[PDB]
Amino acid sequence: DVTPLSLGIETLGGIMTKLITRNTTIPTKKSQVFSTAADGQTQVQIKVFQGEREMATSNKLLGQFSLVGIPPAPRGVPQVEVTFDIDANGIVNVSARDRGTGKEQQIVIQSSGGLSKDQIENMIKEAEKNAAEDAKRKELVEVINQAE
Amino acid sequence: DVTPLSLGIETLGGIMTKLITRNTTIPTKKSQVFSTAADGQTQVQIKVFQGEREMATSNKLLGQFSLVGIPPAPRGVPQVEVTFDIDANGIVNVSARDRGTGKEQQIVIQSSGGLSKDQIENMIKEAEKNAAEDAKRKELVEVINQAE
């Protein structure tokens, strides 16, 4: 009836972009538009992560799939809508769709990534323990605004 | 007189963000506002690169400095103004200033005279030959859609 851990995707620089936050009631659905990181980029890889760390790869990887044949365009121009849908049984459907071409791909993931209650608890604690360390990143970000 | 190579900073994900593009008339001054990558981030590192590659570290590092003690705030909230001020002889004053606190630092770097005509042409040619490789990146970027 609620999600035990946050769910999201890895974005540029290894950032955990949460689509559904921990403790959201189920069923639920959330979508968000993303773009490409490189000029002339023709494919995108969706890496679905579960956990609380801002450093994506320190969370648990639940799925990985690609959308290919995006027509080459300047970085930040394509609109790739990514949707996380969680159904009444906690099945997580993740789809990515390129708005320009309509090309779409999706996967499914079992309820709560198969984790036991103890494993969930561990992950929450570990994330708390490492929160301060994750904040020691030094990078600068150029915001991409697709507003017309 | 003009810049023989682009000049910019490395942003999240190792991206070359050009502030002054190659062939810009000098002297000139260009500024752009950037933000933090992590929630509670208190340091930002300004890495100044010269060259055309989208992969920052494949360009020539000219200088590096930090702003430290940025007040903790959610990622993307702080506003760090980065300015390249270049004189008729290619000398660049690069400053970063936190808009919120006015805290700032700067470095003064030579961007001319450290490369031959041939080295310049070769760097541009090399970048052109490696552009397709940089384009094979698979990452997604977060975007906003906000009229200003």
Swiss-Prot record, chains A, B:
<protein>
    <recommendedName>
        <fullName>Heat shock protein hsp-6</fullName>
    </recommendedName>
</protein>
<comment type="similarity">
    <text>Belongs to the heat shock protein 70 family.</text>
</comment>
